Design a protein around this motif. Structure first.
Motif, mmCIF file in Angstrom:
data_model
loop_
_atom_site.group_PDB
_atom_site.id
_atom_site.type_symbol
_atom_site.label_atom_id
_atom_site.label_comp_id
_atom_site.label_asym_id
_atom_site.label_seq_id
_atom_site.Cartn_x
_atom_site.Cartn_y
_atom_site.Cartn_z
ATOM 1 N N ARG B 624 0.858 -1.176 0.000
ATOM 2 C CA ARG B 624 0.000 0.000 0.000
ATOM 3 C C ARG B 624 0.894 1.226 0.000
ATOM 4 N N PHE B 625 0.284 2.404 0.006
ATOM 5 C CA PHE B 625 1.055 3.630 0.072
ATOM 6 C C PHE B 625 0.879 4.332 1.408
ATOM 7 N N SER B 626 1.930 5.021 1.841
ATOM 8 C CA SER B 626 1.887 5.814 3.057
ATOM 9 C C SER B 626 0.965 6.995 2.834
ATOM 10 N N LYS B 627 0.680 7.734 3.900
ATOM 11 C CA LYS B 627 -0.002 9.007 3.757
ATOM 12 C C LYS B 627 1.000 9.935 3.075
ATOM 13 N N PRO B 628 0.522 10.785 2.155
ATOM 14 C CA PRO B 628 1.439 11.536 1.284
ATOM 15 C C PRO B 628 2.331 12.558 1.995
ATOM 16 N N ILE B 629 3.586 12.634 1.555
ATOM 17 C CA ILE B 629 4.497 13.703 1.947
ATOM 18 C C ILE B 629 4.218 14.912 1.050
ATOM 19 N N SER B 630 3.982 16.076 1.652
ATOM 20 C CA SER B 630 3.691 17.279 0.867
ATOM 21 C C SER B 630 4.950 18.115 0.648
ATOM 22 N N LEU B 631 5.349 18.220 -0.611
ATOM 23 C CA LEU B 631 6.500 19.011 -0.999
ATOM 24 C C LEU B 631 6.013 20.294 -1.654
ATOM 25 N N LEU B 632 6.173 21.412 -0.957
ATOM 26 C CA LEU B 632 5.745 22.695 -1.496
ATOM 27 C C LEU B 632 6.755 23.170 -2.537
ATOM 28 N N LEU B 633 6.255 23.717 -3.639
ATOM 29 C CA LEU B 633 7.125 24.288 -4.654
ATOM 30 C C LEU B 633 7.745 25.557 -4.084
ATOM 31 N N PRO B 634 8.835 26.038 -4.703
ATOM 32 C CA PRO B 634 9.433 27.295 -4.239
ATOM 33 C C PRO B 634 8.466 28.464 -4.413
ATOM 34 N N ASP B 635 8.527 29.434 -3.503
ATOM 35 C CA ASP B 635 7.552 30.525 -3.477
ATOM 36 C C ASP B 635 7.527 31.322 -4.780
ATOM 37 N N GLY B 636 6.406 31.230 -5.487
ATOM 38 C CA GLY B 636 6.220 31.933 -6.740
ATOM 39 C C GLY B 636 5.944 30.974 -7.881
ATOM 40 N N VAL B 637 6.390 29.734 -7.724
ATOM 41 C CA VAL B 637 6.251 28.749 -8.788
ATOM 42 C C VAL B 637 4.870 28.104 -8.803
ATOM 43 N N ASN B 638 4.223 28.178 -9.958
ATOM 44 C CA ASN B 638 2.965 27.492 -10.180
ATOM 45 C C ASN B 638 3.161 26.534 -11.343
ATOM 46 N N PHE B 639 3.154 25.235 -11.051
ATOM 47 C CA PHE B 639 3.452 24.213 -12.055
ATOM 48 C C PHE B 639 2.296 24.010 -13.036
ATOM 49 N N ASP B 640 2.608 24.084 -14.328
ATOM 50 C CA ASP B 640 1.605 23.927 -15.379
ATOM 51 C C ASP B 640 2.133 23.044 -16.502
ATOM 52 N N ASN B 641 1.474 23.088 -17.656
ATOM 53 C CA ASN B 641 1.850 22.221 -18.769
ATOM 54 C C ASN B 641 3.012 22.744 -19.614
ATOM 55 N N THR B 642 3.417 23.988 -19.370
ATOM 56 C CA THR B 642 4.572 24.558 -20.058
ATOM 57 C C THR B 642 5.828 24.309 -19.241
ATOM 58 N N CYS B 643 5.644 23.928 -17.980
ATOM 59 C CA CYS B 643 6.776 23.663 -17.098
ATOM 60 C C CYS B 643 7.319 22.262 -17.311
ATOM 61 N N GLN B 644 8.571 22.060 -16.920
ATOM 62 C CA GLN B 644 9.208 20.763 -17.088
ATOM 63 C C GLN B 644 9.580 20.190 -15.723
ATOM 64 N N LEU B 645 9.327 18.898 -15.543
ATOM 65 C CA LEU B 645 9.669 18.213 -14.302
ATOM 66 C C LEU B 645 10.049 16.770 -14.580
ATOM 67 N N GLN B 646 11.098 16.296 -13.914
ATOM 68 C CA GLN B 646 11.488 14.894 -14.026
ATOM 69 C C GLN B 646 12.123 14.335 -12.750
ATOM 70 N N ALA B 647 11.900 13.045 -12.513
ATOM 71 C CA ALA B 647 12.487 12.338 -11.377
ATOM 72 C C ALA B 647 13.723 11.583 -11.842
ATOM 73 N N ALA B 648 14.895 12.023 -11.395
ATOM 74 C CA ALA B 648 16.148 11.425 -11.847
ATOM 75 C C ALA B 648 17.187 11.337 -10.731
ATOM 76 N N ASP B 649 17.955 10.250 -10.725
ATOM 77 C CA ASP B 649 19.003 10.051 -9.728
ATOM 78 C C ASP B 649 20.226 10.886 -10.092
ATOM 79 N N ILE B 650 20.058 12.202 -10.065
ATOM 80 C CA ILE B 650 21.103 13.123 -10.499
ATOM 81 C C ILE B 650 22.295 13.191 -9.535
ATOM 82 N N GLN B 651 22.174 12.500 -8.401
ATOM 83 C CA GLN B 651 23.251 12.415 -7.417
ATOM 84 C C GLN B 651 24.045 11.116 -7.577
ATOM 85 N N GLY B 652 23.488 10.174 -8.333
ATOM 86 C CA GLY B 652 24.114 8.879 -8.522
ATOM 87 C C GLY B 652 24.035 8.021 -7.277
ATOM 88 N N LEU B 653 22.899 8.079 -6.585
ATOM 89 C CA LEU B 653 22.745 7.418 -5.292
ATOM 90 C C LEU B 653 21.721 6.289 -5.319
#
Ligand code: K
Ligand code: K
Ligand code: K
Lengths: 551, 1457
Positions: B624-653
């Motif tokens: 099952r899944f835990s209760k969700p962790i809420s990650l607030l975007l940085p102040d001013g950012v409103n995520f839409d369809n013109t914005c880009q987002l990806q989940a990547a192991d950019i630390q190599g961890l």
């Protein structure tokens, strides 16, 4: 300052073997001269030690030691320039079975004319192979059985005395030691010594032939010398009753250290020998008060635990008055050589060493003018000096060779002109050395010793006879041809410890006998004084009890 | 030499250690290992030798994440394809090596038929096939036993161990892991029975997984659940001696026929120390872990629900004491409790603890061994920070963060023109944090082809098409190229040739594939039960939602998350529901769903992006899944369809971060790293005795960036062979809580090797280790400098291995050239030999692989800033040989690797004059036993014109250090043969037979310029050839009994050992002293005898030998136990009488009829009573841990009884506390008594005190107890405390209380009486021994008479006046403290203190000791050799080590100046 660049060095081969020991000798008088002293060690094809050479002899192509071993490195045959040649062998159980000693050479081969062959015999199967006997045979003579062991059995009588499996009867060179009783803690509670009959005659020798104790007991003198011990739960000795019935008693502190001791002479009441004894954190004696009210206080250096103070005094309030009897103060070099000693009561002894920590100079005081040092004690100064001018200062210098042989003692007592030099003449092919009065020629030194390396002449008119084991047998003090000689003989137990000393002097004959027993010296004088010396400690405190001839 | 049995009471007591647990030495695999030997009895000697062990690379199991406590097993291969239970299936050795059907000696397939085994007739016939692993380690014999008729029964395995032991695996169904639907489809055979040549057995009983304590939902979700097995009980100390396995009998022996039991509890019993565990389990049933998990490697489901909470030892004391066995219940001896941090994602083993019991039922405890792990903390999630590395991008420019080249870290993939694809590799950022990543210069992608809507492409290249490219398409009225790149491993293996459910899923083929995380890919289509339909407002993807290691199928809607298990070969299983995820159907957008392992649990989590929030749903072990962790975007950012987002192991961890690009917002580029470390890895150990080890990991990817930077700076070309992140043991901090001292061990890795062909990790080629002392004193008073060890290991890949020797230190131009691997073929008709050959390329792959992990070279340096610091103290190098071994597989040779050459140089940091030794194994037999070997000692090099040693030395030492013995080349030859019992069905190898040594000595001129190799040594002109003269060094022979002649039977009973003492050369020691007859009769009398010279050449004369070590043994019914012993035949026998079941000897009788008798405490099988040869009694009392806590003795003296009162006459109760024991009065009937306090370093806390301070009526106490902040017996646990603080904090009131509460190092009190209890002068001597957290002797305190001493405060410091001078007082509580030692991390005595008096037995603090107590300081070099001593007075002693001489300077030598 004299020690700069004087390390100790070990030099290796390619197989982890120490082939060189290198030292650096520097005398404080000549600090620009540094002698490199090299000891050599040669190892064979099997990696075992074959030769060793000191710095002195190596230069003269003579080998201090040669060894021949088995396939495992155990030495079988040895050639020593000091101890002569020897042959030993152990069995498969690891037990010594043979030792041939006092062997020399000359014609090339080994001279066995005076070789001493000691062999060891053990219980045969099906017995556990315990030591049975020790046989001793000098070349050309008959073999004597010098030792024999008898072991107790499994009987209830033996078990109740805790003797099962114990050597209950030990026949040695002096006679017999019987073990009568053993503690619950495995300690002897009762031992008894019987002497061989007529030990006064130096020609009578132990020889325990056969396996019958009845026939042996007949060879023993009638007296039985029994020492009785009582031990505590931890196996430590509490009480001791000697052969004449005197008791020594000790008591230990909460840490099990000797805290007090007492003496009860036979027929007497218990008296204090040591009243109280305290210790440092390192377990060294700190303060020791005896029955005479005298107190010794030991002072130690905190960093090193070195003894820098010894103060024996009658303390304040003592019946005979407060007085410092002795106050020794020690000053050391960083390595721990005694540089100086003072005594309070100005007098001071100063010491100088070489880089090898050999004593090269010593200052002190003596009753001058004494005369040239010899075997004799000075005549005693009686009574005790009140003035110290009765003493004069001396300075001695010491001279050693590359092999550590003390060659010269130069005594300098300027004020009383008591100046002399004791010279030791050293062989050129060994470490054998004698005083110059015996010979000044290095080439004649070795003849003055046995093949074993035991000295044959003490002084000019004085000769030395030795036992096959290399024990000192007879000192011939004044030889009178045939046959009344001033002499002193000795007897030893199986452990080569002295048990009997007999001195004889012509006047009918002054004969002085000394019988050494546990905590006791029994000394008779005839030509009659009967003295029993109670030895207390281990020897520190001594008590003189006359049965006869008290002066 | 043979040991003679001697009966004695346990003569010890004082020291305090643990279970012998240890952290593993750092190796070329980079994994952290830990190991704990199970603290239970060995019985008669044959016992399960299990360890509870941890590995940072291991997964989850019945002992928590990363741990395991299992026996040998054989499983099917899964790592190169899912087994299908046909004849194409492969089998792994217990070592994990792939096996092949072996060839016999006749050159055929080794197959046999059998109806008999170990003399036991089998009910039906078996086909017995010998299998052989690709790598041979221990020459074990492996047989597959298959019934000729399939319905006659199940197959099983037999493993014959070279020690003569026989092991049977999976004979009955409890020891088999099999398909829940088809019991015939066996995945694994577990060890079930072991038998030894002594007729001693070990039986292993397992329990199958079930539905006990499972929720109905769990049952509904996993009906196929019966596969897994759990170790349940081990029976040993079999009462009946039987040479044959019990499993071959009609019925297994009754449970009563085993003297010893080891029970494994999985929660069915009370965990409390106050409840004594019984041998009988139930009826509560085992508990269900919260983090249940499935594995699908074998093409079947294996469900895992159970955790081991207790391990228990049981003895049949009545049977062992030969008392009435009727209705016997075995009694608990030792109890091991296991505490877990229970968690729905990953449960972690956090404590193990020994508990045992007094006769009154009171618990006596050992300090718990605690562990803790790196953990994901939602509160310590780093916020967003800008990502300047993308500054060059406009904010509309699309990009993909992907590991294009396979470096373990993703770089930047983009389209610049468009149409042209360029890549920027990840690189170590300069100047920044050590793990900071920037991106290098652009590089053009190879020509991208594009055809069936999706095509393959090779980029790296490798020649492997590692990349699947697709293109989005196509709507709407827009003409248009922008493609998608997808790593092939994110897809099921059978993607391009689908069968079964995958084919039903894909149909003609997928339109598009879009990465939504590091290893998760969303699917796009063309337009049994019950696959989803690709193409609603739904998302279908490939992701590991189960944490099992496969790309499973996942469907996500607004209200559901379903997962179909990839069962392999196109097969997918029934759907699993994962509750916990929900989004309103009016706002739910599949495009905004990302699938990535955030917490490093192994499962893919859900990240959903809102306009202002990212919700993260952690996947709880695929359930099952835990209760969700809420990650607030940085102040001013409103995520839409013109914005880009990806989940990547950019630390190599191995864990996903978030890269967001938002146009019309400055800055435009953003990061969110949710963790800086990989969670669930063991990072702290503490034994609550004063020792704590902290661990630190670093990714193989970061290490690769550093390595690549150095390589690029060195003009060379970087080539990475490790395509994914591995977590490597980077740092160990070993901390001494008592002294405050530390030891840092640091590891650097290079040349990482993963094999693509066999999909296998080979390991690291270079491992560098630094060891640095860190003293609490924090001064320079102990001036140690870190040590550095550079080690090179073979990876088994030539392209890597061939580059290693270039990195070797080359500062010694005269050093011999590097070793090269040697490949041989085996020719055993009938003595055997290795013949060197050059293998084919295909053979070379496997023969090279055989060298995996082998140490090639090691160099030891001292980094002390001295001019000579770059010259190693020593260098060691090895040459390996791989013997190729043919099986029925024509394409894969089997192999055995061995170290044939070893060469060691001792430089002591002077490059020109080292010592050199070299050991060479010249010949080995078919079983790897050395037949011919040689040790070589090289001569010293030629003396130079000037000294390379300091001018601080005397000017003559250089010349005088040369000695002719240094110039002789030494070669020591060693021959040996063996007894190998391989006839019929027995397997016992390497039995000692004969050995002989010979010496060879040569002049330096004959020493080869390039040195010796094996070839040089088997050459016809060898320096140790049959022509050369030699010195016989001796020989050794072992003679056996019963027995053909003096040859061994399977029981290998030694009659005697025979070694040479004298030969014709050594006999020359007798020459001038004794003649031949006398000499011979002397030798004969001394127990020596003549025997043939072994390995005899040219009529060599017989040698005088010594035979030692004679034993007589019983028969099989007495378990072949020794009955009599004797050293030689010169003495009589000592007789042994054993107890009822031949566990211990109870009586000895020597050759003079002396009898010793012993009586044993059978919970430990150690004697507690002894009657000696004089009928005296000796007696000890043992605590429940086998420690002597009282002793006395009695018997007779002079007929009269003495001395201590018998236990019957005057019982003695050892005081429960030291305070009470110190206050004892005289008249105690014991010689010794002891109180052990191994937990004194744990602060003591009571329910009463905590409740009185908190005034909460026990609330905080009960909670702290529940969490094991504190034990039930009131000891504060270090790690439990830290964990508690990290989760809940701690009141300042409790902090105050704890500050009032003292610690004291683990210690024992031994009281020794002065006299027997009848004596009123009896004193009680008192000695207290201190141990540290490493088992080292800290100090010893002896009670002394009253007097002057320093004064210890309550805070453990010295009482000092205002100025700082220690107070001097007179007390009757004075102690003498001796042997006080301050150790470093390596157990070396850095400060040895002078003895001192104190007004307490308690440990005086190291601060006060260093400040006010005198000590000599000892300074050790990287070789652990003392080289300097600073005395208390301040003088110095020094020792200088050179290869050819050691220089010693004392206090006088160094005082100037
Ligand atoms: K010196
Ligand atoms: K007795
Ligand atoms: K996860």
């Amino acid at each position: 300052q004299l020690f700069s660049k004087t390390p100790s060095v070990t030099v290796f081969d390619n197989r982890g073997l120490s082939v060189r020991d290198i030292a650096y000798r520097r005398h404080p008088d000549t600090p620009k001269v540094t002698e490199e002293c090299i000891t050599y060690h040669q190892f064979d094809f099997r990696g075992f030690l074959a030769q060793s050479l000191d710095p002195r002899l190596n230069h003269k192509e003579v080998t201090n030691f040669s060894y021949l071993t088995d396939l495992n490195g155990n030495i079988i045959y040895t050639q020593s320039v000091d101890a002569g040649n020897t042959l030993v062998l152990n069995d498969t159980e690891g037990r010594s079975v043979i030792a041939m000693t006092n062997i020399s050479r000359e014609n090339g081969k080994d001279d066995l004319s005076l070789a001493v062959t000691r062999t060891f015999q053990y219980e045969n199967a099906p017995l556990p192979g315990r030591p049975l006997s020790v046989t001793e045979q000098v070349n050309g003579e008959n073999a004597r059985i010098t030792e024999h062991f008898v072991y107790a059995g499994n009987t209830p009588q033996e078990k109740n005395l805790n003797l099962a499996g114990q050597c209950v009867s030990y026949y040695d060179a002096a006679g017999l030691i019987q073990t009568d009783s053993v503690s619950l803690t495995g300690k002897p509670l009762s031992v008894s010594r019987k002497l061989l009959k007529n030990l006064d005659d130096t020609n009578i020798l132990a020889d325990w032939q056969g396996n019958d104790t009845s026939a042996w007991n007949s060879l023993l003198a009638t007296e039985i010398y029994t020492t009785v011990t009582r031990t505590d739960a931890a196996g430590a000795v509490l009480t001791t009753i000697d052969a004449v019935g005197n008791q020594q008693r000790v008591a230990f502190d909460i840490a099990g250290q000797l805290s007090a001791s007492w003496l009860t002479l036979k027929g007497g009441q218990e008296q204090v020998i040591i009243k109280v004894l305290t210790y440092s954190a390192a377990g060294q004696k700190l303060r020791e008060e005896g029955g005479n009210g005298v107190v010794t206080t030991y002072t130690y250096e905190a960093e090193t635990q070195r003894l820098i103070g010894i103060k024996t005094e009658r303390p304040n309030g003592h019946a005979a008055g407060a007085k410092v009897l002795q106050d020794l103060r020690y000053e050391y070099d960083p390595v721990g050589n005694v540089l100086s000693i003072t005594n309070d009561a100005v007098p001071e002894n100063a010491y100088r060493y070489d880089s090898l920590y050999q004593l090269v100079s010593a200052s002190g005081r003596e009753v001058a003018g004494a005369g040239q040092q010899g075997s004799d004690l000075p005549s005693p100064l009686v009574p005790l000096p009140s003035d110290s001018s009765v003493y004069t200062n001396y300075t001695r210098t010491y001279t050693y060779d590359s092999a550590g042989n003390l060659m010269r003692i130069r005594h300098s007592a300027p004020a009383t002109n008591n100046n002399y030099t004791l010279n030791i003449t050293v062989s050129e092919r060994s470490n054998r050395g004698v005083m110059s009065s015996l010979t000044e020629n290095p080439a004649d030194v070795d003849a003055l010793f046995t093949a074993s390396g035991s000295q044959k002449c003490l002084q000019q008119g004085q000769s030395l006879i030795w036992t096959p084991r290399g024990e000192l047998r007879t000192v011939l003090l004044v030889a009178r041809g045939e046959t009344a000689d001033d002499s002193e003989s000795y007897r030893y137990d199986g452990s080569s410890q002295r048990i009997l000393k007999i001195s004889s002097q012509q006047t009918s004959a002054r004969v002085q006998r000394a019988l050494y027993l546990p905590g006791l010296e029994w000394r008779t004088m005839t030509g009659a004084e009967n003295l029993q010396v109670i030895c207390i400690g281990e020897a520190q405190v001594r008590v003189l009890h006359w049965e006869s001839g008290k002066p | 030499e043979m040991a003679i049995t001697t009966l004695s009471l346990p003569k010890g007591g004082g020291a305090i250690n643990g279970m012998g647990e240890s952290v593993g030495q750092a190796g070329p695999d980079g994994m952290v290992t830990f190991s704990i030997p199970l603290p239970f009895s060995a019985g008669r000697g044959v016992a399960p030798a299990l360890s509870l062990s941890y590995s940072s690379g291991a997964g989850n199991g019945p002992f928590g994440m990363g741990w395991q406590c299992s026996a040998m097993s054989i499983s099917r291969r899964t790592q190169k394809g899912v087994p299908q239970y046909n004849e194409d299936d492969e089998f792994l050795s217990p070592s994990g090596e792939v096996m092949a059907i072996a060839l016999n000696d006749s050159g055929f397939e080794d197959v046999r038929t059998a109806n008999r085994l170990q003399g036991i007739p089998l009910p039906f016939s078996y086909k017995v096939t010998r299998y052989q692993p690709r790598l041979i380690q221990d020459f074990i014999k492996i047989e597959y036993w298959q019934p000729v008729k399939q319905t006659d029964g199940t197959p099983f395995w037999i493993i014959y161990s070279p020690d003569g032991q026989t092991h049977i695996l999976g004979k009955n169904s409890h020891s088999r892991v099999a398909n829940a639907e088809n019991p015939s489809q066996i995945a694994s055979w577990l060890l079930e029975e072991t038998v030894t040549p002594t007729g001693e057995h070990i039986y292993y009983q397992y329990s199958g997984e079930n539905q006990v304590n499972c929720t109905d939902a769990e049952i509904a979700l996993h009906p196929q659940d019966s596969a897994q097995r759990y170790l349940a009980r081990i029976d040993y100390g079999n009462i009946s001696p039987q040479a044959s396995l019990f499993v071959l009998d009609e019925e297994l022996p009754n449970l009563t026929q085993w003297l010893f039991h080891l029970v494994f509890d999985y929660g069915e019993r009370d965990i409390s120390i106050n409840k004594i565990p019984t041998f009988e389990g139930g009826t509560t049933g085992w508990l269900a872990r919260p983090d249940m998990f499935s594995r699908y490697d074998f093409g079947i489901e294996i469900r895992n629900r159970r955790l081991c909470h207790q391990v228990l030892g049981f003895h049949r004391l009545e049977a062992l004491n030969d008392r009435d066995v009727t209705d016997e219940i075995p009694v608990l001896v030792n109890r091991l409790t296991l505490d877990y941090d229970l968690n729905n994602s990953v449960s972690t083993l956090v404590a193990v603890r020994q508990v045992a019991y007094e006769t009154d039922g009171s618990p006596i405890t050992q300090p718990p061994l605690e562990f803790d792990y790196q953990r994901f903390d939602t509160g310590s999630i780093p916020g967003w920070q800008e990502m300047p590395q993308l500054e060059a991008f406009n904010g509309y420019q699309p990009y993909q963060m992907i590991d294009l080249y396979g470096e373990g870290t993703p770089g930047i993939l983009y389209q610049e023109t468009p149409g042209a694809w360029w890549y920027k590799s990840p690189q170590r950022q300069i100047g920044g944090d050590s793990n900071a990543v920037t991106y290098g210069a652009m590089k053009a992608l190879p020509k991208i082809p594009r055809l069936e809507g999706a095509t393959l492409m090779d980029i790296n290249g490798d020649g492997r098409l590692d990349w699947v490219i697709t293109s989005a398409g196509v709507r709407g009225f827009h003409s248009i190229e922008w493609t998608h790149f997808t790593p092939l491993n994110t897809l099921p293996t059978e993607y391009f040739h689908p069968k079964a459910q995958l084919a039903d899923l894909v149909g003609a083929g997928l339109s598009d594939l879009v990465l939504i995380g590091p290893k998760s890919v969303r699917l796009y289509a063309n337009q049994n039960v019950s696959l989803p339909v690709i193409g609603s407002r739904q998302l279908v993807a490939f992701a590991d939602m189960l944490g099992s290691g496969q790309q499973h199928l996942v469907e996500i809607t607004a209200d559901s998350v379903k997962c179909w298990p990839n069962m392999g070969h196109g097969r997918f299983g029934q759907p699993l529901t994962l509750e916990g995820f929900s989004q309103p159907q009016t706002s739910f957008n599949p495009d905004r769903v990302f699938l990535a392992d955030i917490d490093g649990s192994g499962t893919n989590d859900i990240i959903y992006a809102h306009s202002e929030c990212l919700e993260i749903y952690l996947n709880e072990s695929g359930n099952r899944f835990s209760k969700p962790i809420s990650l607030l975007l940085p102040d001013g950012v409103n995520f839409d369809n013109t914005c880009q987002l990806q989940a990547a192991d950019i630390q190599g961890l191995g864990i996903a971060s978030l890269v967001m690009t938002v146009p019309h917002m400055s800055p435009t580029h953003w990061r969110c790293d949710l963790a800086l470390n990989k969670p669930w890895l063991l990072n702290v150990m503490n034994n609550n005795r004063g020792a704590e080890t902290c661990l630190f990991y670093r990714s193989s990817a970061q290490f690769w960036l550093d390595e690549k930077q150095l390589v690029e700076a060195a003009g060379q070309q970087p080539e990475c062979h490790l395509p994914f992140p591995m977590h490597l043991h980077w740092r160990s901090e070993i901390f001494d809580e008592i002294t405050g001292n530390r030891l840092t061990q640091e590891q650097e890795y290079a040349h990482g090797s993963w094999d693509g062909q066999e999909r296998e990790f080979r390991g690291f080629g270079r491992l560098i280790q630094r060891d640095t002392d860190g003293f609490a004193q924090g001064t320079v008073d102990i001036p140690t400098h870190p040590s550095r060890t550079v080690s090179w290991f073979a990876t088994g890949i030539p392209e890597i291995d061939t580059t290693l020797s270039a990195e070797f230190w080359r500062g010694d131009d005269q050093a011999f050239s590097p070793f090269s691997p040697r490949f041989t073929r085996w020719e055993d008709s009938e003595a055997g030999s290795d013949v060197a050959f050059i293998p084919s390329e295909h053979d070379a792959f496997w023969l090279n692989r055989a060298m995996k992990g082998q140490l090639l070279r090691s160099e030891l340096y001292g980094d002390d800033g001295t001019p000579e610091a770059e010259i190693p103290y020593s260098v060691t190098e090895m040459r390996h040989q791989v013997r190729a071994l043919p099986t029925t597989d024509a394409t894969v040779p089997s192999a055995w690797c061995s170290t044939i050459e070893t060469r060691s140089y001792q430089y002591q940091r002077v490059a020109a004059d080292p010592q050199c030794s070299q050991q060479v194994v010249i010949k080995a037999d078919r079983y790897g036993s050395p037949l011919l070997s040689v040790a070589i000692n090289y001569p010293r090099r030629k003396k130079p014109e000037k000294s390379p040693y300091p001018d601080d030395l005397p000017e003559t030492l250089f010349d005088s250090s040369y000695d002719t013995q240094q110039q002789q080349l030494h070669l020591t030859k060693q021959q040996q043969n063996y007894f190998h019992l391989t006839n019929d069905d027995n397997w016992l190898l390497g039995l000692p037979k004969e050995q002989r040594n010979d010496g060879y000595q040569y002049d330096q001129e004959r020493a080869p310029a390039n040195g010796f190799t094996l070839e040089t040594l088997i050459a016809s002109n060898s320096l140790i050839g049959s022509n050369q003269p030699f010195t016989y060094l001796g020989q050794s022979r072992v003679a056996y009994q019963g027995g053909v002649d003096e040859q061994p039977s399977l029981q290998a009973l030694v009659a005697y050992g025979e070694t040479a003492i004298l030969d014709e050369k050594t006999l020359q020691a007798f020459v001038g002293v004794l003649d031949s007859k006398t000499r011979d009769e002397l030798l004969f009398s001394a127990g020596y005898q003549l025997a043939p010279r072994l390995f005899r050449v040219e009529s060599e004369p017989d040698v005088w030998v010594a035979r030692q070590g004679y034993s007589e043994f019983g028969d099989y019914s007495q378990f072949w136990r020794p009955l009599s012993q004797r050293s030689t035949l010169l003495t009589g026998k000592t007789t042994l009488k054993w107890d009822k079941h031949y566990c211990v000897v109870i009586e000895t009788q020597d050759a003079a009829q002396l009898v010793t008798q012993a009586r044993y405490d059978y919970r430990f099988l150690t004697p507690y009573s002894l009657t000696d040869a004089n009928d005296n009694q000796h007696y000890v009392v043992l605590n429940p841990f086998g420690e002597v806590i009282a002793s006395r003795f009695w018997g007779t003296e002079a007929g009269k009884d003495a001395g201590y009162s018998t236990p019957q006459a005057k019982p003695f109760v050892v005081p429960a506390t030291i305070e009470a024991a110190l206050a004892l009065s005289p008249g105690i009937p014991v010689a010794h008594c002891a109180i052990f306090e191994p937990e004194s370093w744990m602060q003591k806390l009571t329910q009463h005190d905590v409740s009185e301070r908190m005034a909460d009526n026990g609330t905080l106490w009960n909670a702290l107890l529940q969490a094991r902040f504190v034990t039930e017996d009131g000891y504060v646990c270090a790690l439990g405390r830290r964990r508690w603080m990290a989760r809940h904090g701690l009141s300042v009131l409790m902090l105050t209380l704890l500050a009032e509460i003292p610690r004291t190092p683990p210690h024992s009190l031994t009281i020794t009486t002065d006299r027997y209890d009848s004596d009123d002068q009896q004193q009680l001597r008192q000695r207290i021994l201190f141990s540290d957290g490493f088992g080292r002797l800290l100090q010893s305190a002896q009670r002394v008479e009253a007097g002057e001493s320093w004064q210890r405060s309550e805070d453990s410091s010295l009482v000092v006046n205002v100025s700082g001078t220690p107070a001097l007082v007179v007390t009757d509580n004075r102690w003498a403290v001796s042997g006080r030692t301050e150790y470093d991390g390596k157990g070396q005595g850095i400060r040895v203190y002078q003895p001192y008096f104190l007004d307490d037995w308690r440990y005086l603090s190291d601060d006060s000791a260093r400040t006010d107590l005198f000590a000599d300081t000892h300074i050790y070099d990287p070789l652990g050799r003392e080289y300097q001593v600073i005395t208390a007075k301040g003088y110095r002693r020094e020792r200088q080590y050179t290869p050819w001489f050691v220089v010693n300077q004392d206090e006088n030598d160094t005082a100037a100046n």
